[PDB]
Write a protein that binds this ligand. Structure first.
Ligand SMILES: O=C(c1ccco1)N1CCN(C(=O)C2CC2)CC1
Ligand SMILES: O=C(c1ccco1)N1CCN(C(=O)C2CC2)CC1
Ligand SMILES: [Cl-]
Ligand SMILES: [Mg+2]
Ligand SMILES: [Mg+2]
Ligand SMILES: [Mg+2]
Ligand SMILES: [Mg+2]
Lengths: 194, 194
């Protein structure tokens, strides 16, 4: 029933733009929305990937590998799944493995890859693939792994046991001003609810 | 170690603005980011999203979701019920109110997250994730009455919690919908648990 009628540029940065979206409502009435989009999406299935990296290690409980970074939009430190934008021509899987290695040092193995999922659909068109990757922590590749952070990337790795993820996150947020990512929180919640 | 030095308005609409953020990287080098922000926040967070567990005896427990046209996405999305928190509303009351408006269900608060970030590489947007149970055997939830305010057009989709990920993948496959990243993240962890 509903569809886009027109999209008029309001302001274009180097990385992000704002648009006035006109669309048809199901009553048959024209309405508008203020939409955010990135400037960087070309032919990729989505803007980015986030990685759910399950660290598996003999006689260890499975950990979820997370990263902590300063996020200028937020004005503070955030705890998230490893993530980055998909390079032109890169597959979501390759991007996930590459970002995981750059951000954490770990060399993972693909498990599964979501369809493109929307980050904040009342606000932006931005999308990701959520890529589950296992990390064989018994492999010597993954023994004492060096993050290879790109220019201006400053990332800390935090591995937390899957079996206590939510309480461990709640305890980190108790100790300091940091914000947990909604996707990480959502996944830690489901782990409790299951 | 990292922090915001200053913010420059680039463009301000009625609902969203774009800012150029100057911040200090951990080396002592000054860098910029194109930060997006809502103009509506006053509150704990911009919004709430509701994880609504519909519990009926002798049925599978379901997670109640909503399907809506999202103009920034150019299409239909499947999401947790959600909306912005009104001035002087608590995140709990916002949750029960949005849930009622969008689904017609009346629920009870189980738990409520701290403020969590929506897309921290892009925006300062935050929500409270509020887990809510719905006693689907109560008379008030028998023939649920959804009260859309002006311009909301919301279809309700309940899905069994025990097969949530497979049910969502099916809808994407069949209906050309975009699943929300938080919904998908939750659905993933229900499978990944134990
Ligand atoms: O443009 C926006 C907006 C919000 C975030 C980004 O853009 N709005 C939201 C407020 N309104 C509504 O809720 C629509 C009538 C349903 C009107 C349009
Ligand atoms: O301004 C933005 C941006 C992207 C989305 C919203 O704003 N960027 C992104 C890429 N940046 C880097 O990766 C710097 C090396 C740290 C430079 C500026
Ligand atoms: Cl529950
Ligand atoms: Mg990243
Ligand atoms: Mg990166
Ligand atoms: Mg809503
Ligand atoms: Mg509503």
């Amino acid at each position: 029933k509903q569809y886009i009628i027109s999209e008029e540029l309001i302001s274009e940065g180097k990385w992000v733009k704002l648009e006035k979206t006109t669309y048809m409502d199901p009553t048959g009435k024209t309405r508008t929305w203020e939409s955010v989009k990135r400037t960087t999406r070309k032919e990729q299935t989505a803007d980015g990937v986030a990685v759910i990296p399950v660290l598996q290690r003999t006689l260890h409980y499975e950990c979820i590998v997370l990263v902590k970074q300063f996020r200028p939009p937020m004005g503070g430190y955030c705890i998230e799944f490893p993530a980055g934008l998909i390079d032109d021509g890169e597959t979501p899987e390759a991007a996930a493995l590459r970002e995981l290695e750059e951000e954490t040092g770990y060399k993972g193995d693909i498990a599964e890859c979501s369809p493109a999922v929307c980050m904040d659909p009342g606000l932006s068109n931005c999308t990701i693939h959520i890529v589950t990757v296992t990390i064989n922590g018994d492999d010597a590749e993954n023994a004492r792994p060096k993050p290879k952070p790109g220019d201006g990337e400053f990332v800390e790795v935090i591995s937390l046991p899957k079996n206590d993820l939510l309480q461990r996150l709640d305890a980190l947020v108790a100790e300091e001003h940091l914000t947990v990512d909604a996707r990480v929180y959502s996944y830690a919640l489901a782990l409790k609810h299951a």
